[PDB]
């Protein structure tokens, strides 16, 4: 919800820097010389960066030998069909790489298996200046590494096709992360337009990071593998650790919890990790069901919750939600809805991006008037 607060960076600035160096006079020869003996070498570039270099395909040797002398004629005839088939095999990877680059303006993400095969990717990870625990992490999550990687077309000069592959490095590992789910909290009075609403806007992923907390407002940007959360710090805000106080005490003085207000008592559900939050208002039919019995709970007006234990689906109006079936314990923490603490006569009912204290000061000003 708070995505417009994010800063602006360029994800591929590192790869572009290496790419521009490859455009430098004499730069191709250093790579070409280091790969004349082997297929995998570590070259230092003219701008003082050390890059792993990888030759994944040698079309030159094949063409020059099994094709070029036969077509440097005069009368040419091809020596059997396997020569044509094998060439199509060798040439295919080049055509596919060019194909992806041509519709992505030279920059692709995620990195395809054509750009870098599953075998080649695992080889790269093994030769990186990283911890053995970092090697195991990337190797067990290569599909995540791929999605968070970029392939940048660089040069095709002096019988060399070169492109930069930009892989992620995870400098923050095994710190506790938590996901905040929020849903509208409204009063439940019978008159139709007589209700006021409040919603916490700070939903998303939170991870402890370097004495502070990394907050990802677009929780969709994070990738979850079992209990491991892969995120990009470029898509985060850096907040004080006191932001967690909003979960236990939303009126705490140490942190100004962010909320939005309205008079729209519309019904919906939020599927969490181990259950479902249900905001049921008006005349909406809200239920929770199991696969065998059917309906086992009918929600009354207000904001309620059910765990995934024994619950398979949740229905709010004409919308059916499947709950996540992951194992884990849920704790229902009772407490009076804070929306009841407000006087509807002076309640600011259209704060799109506000906070607890901001709402309070507006109430004080309206009260003084």
């Amino acid at each position: 919800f708070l995505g417009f607060l994010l800063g602006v960076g360029s994800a591929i600035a590192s790869g572009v820097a290496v790419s521009k160096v490859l455009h430098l006079e004499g730069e191709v020869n250093k790579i070409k010389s280091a790969l004349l003996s082997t297929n995998k070498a570590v070259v230092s570039l003219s701008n003082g960066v050390s890059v792993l270099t990888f030759k994944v395909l040698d079309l030159k040797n094949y063409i020059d030998k099994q094709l070029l002398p036969i077509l440097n004629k005069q009368s040419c005839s091809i020596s059997n069909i396997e020569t044509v088939i094998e060439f199509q095999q060798k040439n295919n990877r080049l055509l596919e790489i060019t194909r992806e680059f041509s519709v992505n303006a030279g920059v692709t993400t995620p990195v395809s298996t054509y750009m870098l095969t599953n075998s080649e990717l695992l080889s790269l990870i093994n030769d990186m200046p990283i911890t053995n625990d970092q090697k195991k992490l990337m190797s067990n999550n290569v599909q995540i590494v791929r999605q968070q990687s970029y392939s940048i077309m660089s040069i095709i000069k002096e019988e060399v096709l070169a492109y930069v592959v930009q892989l992620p490095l995870y400098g923050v590992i095994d710190t506790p992360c938590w996901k905040l789910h929020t849903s509208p909290l409204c009063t439940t009075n019978t008159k139709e337009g007589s209700n006021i609403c409040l919603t916490r806007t700070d939903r998303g992923w939170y991870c402890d990071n370097a004495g502070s907390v990394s907050f990802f407002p677009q929780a969709e940007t994070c990738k979850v593998q079992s209990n491991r959360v892969f995120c990009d710090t470029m898509n985060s805000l850096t907040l004080p650790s006191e932001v967690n106080l909003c979960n236990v005490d939303i009126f705490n003085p140490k942190y100004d919890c962010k909320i939005m207000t309205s008079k729209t008592d519309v019904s919906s559900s939020v599927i969490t990790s181990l259950g479902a939050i249900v905001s049921c208002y008006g005349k909406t039919k809200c239920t929770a069901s199991n696969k065998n019995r059917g309906i086992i709970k009918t929600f009354s007006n207000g904001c309620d919750y059910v765990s995934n234990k024994g619950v398979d689906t949740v229905s709010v109006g004409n919308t059916l939600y499947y709950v996540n079936k992951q194992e884990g314990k849920s704790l229902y923490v009772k407490g009076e809805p804070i929306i009841n603490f407000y006087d509807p006569l002076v309640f600011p009912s259209d704060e799109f991006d506000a906070s607890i204290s901001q709402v309070n000061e507006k109430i004080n000003q309206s009260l003084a008037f």
Partner: protein, 81 residues
């Protein structure tokens, strides 16, 4: 060990027990494909197999041509303001 707490007072829930893997840096590697220079083959051939090789070689030359344009271009630059 994933757990979850629901807070009735604020209509919100927190799922805990997760472990981080935040990208802080980048590793840039250079992937290379060794190509060959071929222009205007002095051959006709007019047989089935050379014809197949030629038109496959045409795909090759067209790919090289297209890649040459992308070398001259500047990558991406689709940034917010």
């Amino acid at each position: 060990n994933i757990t979850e707490e629901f807070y009735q007072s604020t209509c919100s829930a927190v799922s805990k027990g997760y472990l981080s893997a935040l990208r802080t840096g980048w590793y840039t590697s250079v992937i290379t494909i060794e190509l060959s220079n071929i222009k205007e083959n002095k051959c006709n051939g007019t047989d089935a197999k050379v014809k197949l090789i030629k038109q496959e070689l045409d795909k090759y030359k067209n790919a090289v041509t297209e890649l040459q344009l992308l070398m001259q271009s500047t990558p991406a630059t689709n940034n917010r303001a």
